[PDB]
Paper text:
Since such structural information could provide crucial insight into the molecular details of the cleavage site selection, we attempted to crystallize a substitution variant (in one of the catalytic residues) of BsMiniIII with [name]. Until now, however, we managed to obtain only crystals of the free enzyme, not the complex with the substrate [name]. The structure was solved by molecular replacement and refined at 1.8-Å resolution to an R-free of 26.76%. Unfortunately, the loop α5b-α6, suggested to play a major role in contacting the RNA substrate, was not visible in the crystallographic model. A long loop between helices α5 and α6 of the canonical RNases III, including the RBM 4, in [name] RNases is replaced by an additional helix, called α5b and a short loop connecting the α5b and α6 helices (called loop α5b-α6). First, we superimposed the BsMiniIII structure onto the A. aeolicus [name] III complex structure and copied the coordinate of the RNA. We homology-modeled the BsMiniIII target [name] using ModeRNA and finally modeled the missing loop, minimizing steric clashes between the protein and the RNA. The resulting model suggested that the loop α5b-α6 in BsMiniIII, which is missing from the [name] III, can be easily placed in the major groove of the substrate, where it could make contacts with the target tetranucleotide sequence ACCU/AGGU. Therefore, we inferred that residues in this region may be responsible for sequence-specific recognition of the RNA substrate by BsMiniIII. However, both variants lost the [name] activity completely, suggesting that the presence of an intact loop α5b-α6 is indispensable for the cleavage of [name] by BsMiniIII.
Numbering used by the authors:
A (entry chain A), B (entry chain A): 24 to 106, 113 to 154
Write the structure that this text describes.
C-alpha cells in the first residue's frame, strides 16, 4: 500500500476506521486457516472476535501483559479519547482499532502481526 | 500472512468471505490516502463503493475491458454459482469478492493491487 503523508497525525477515529478493517482481514484469514469453511460458521466466529466487547477485553488483557511501547500507549490514548454500545467498551475498542490502524499505516508490519496474533490467541480462546 | 493448505480448493463463499474484507481494507486505505479524514465522510464513501450493487457494476465494467485471465474467469464462475439484495447483484458481487479472496490467498499481490485499483477507479468515479 502507498504511504499516506502525515498518516501519523490522523485523528483517533480515522486511525480506528482503517484498523477495524485490518483486524477483520486478519481474523477472517485466521478462521480460514483453522479449517473452517462454512459460511454461517465463519461469520458467527469472526463477528464474535471482532465485536467491541471482545476488542475491549483483548486490549485489557494486553495491558496487563504490559505488551505496549510508549509510542503505542500514546496512540491508544488518542483512540480512547477520540470524540447499543457501552461508553467504556466503545472507548477501549476504538483505542485497539486506532493502534492497529496506526501500525498498519506506519508500515510496522512485524509488530502488527505480533499484536494481532496475541489478540487472536486471547479472543478466540 | 501464512499460506493456507489447498486454499485454491475453497468454495466460492469462503473465498468471497476473505475477499470482501480485503476489498474493505483497500477501499478504506484509498479514502484515507485521498485526504478524507472525517468519520461520517469516510463511512458514507466506503459503504457506497463496497456495496453489492457497486461491486456488480465494477465486475461488469471489468468484463467489458476483458480484464481477466482464464484462471481468474474460472474463479469468478465459482463465486457467481456459490450456493434486500437482488439475486443477480448477489451473484456478481460474490463472484468479484471470491476473485479478490483467491488472488489474496494465492499471494498474487501484484495482480490483486492492479485489479483493486482498476475497481476503485471505476467505483469511485
Amino acid at each position: 500500500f502507498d504511504t499516506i503523508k502525515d498518516s501519523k497525525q490522523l485523528n483517533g477515529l480515522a486511525l480506528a476506521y482503517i484498523g477495524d478493517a485490518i483486524f477483520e482481514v486478519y481474523v477472517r484469514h485466521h478462521l480460514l486457516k483453522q479449517g473452517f469453511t462454512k459460511p454461517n460458521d465463519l461469520h458467527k466466529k469472526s463477528s464474535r472476535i471482532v465485536s467491541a466487547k471482545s476488542q475491549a477485553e483483548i486490549l485489557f488483557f494486553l495491558q496487563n501483559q504490559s505488551f505496549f511501547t510508549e509510542e503505542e500507549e500514546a496512540v491508544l490514548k488518542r483512540g480512547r479519547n477520540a470524540k447499543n454500545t457501552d461508553v467504556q467498551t466503545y472507548r477501549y475498542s476504538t483505542a485497539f482499532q486506532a493502534l492497529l490502524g496506526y501500525l498498519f499505516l506506519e508500515k510496522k508490519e512485524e509488530r502488527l502481526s505480533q499484536l494481532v496474533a496475541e489478540a487472536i490467541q486471547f479472543g478466540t480462546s
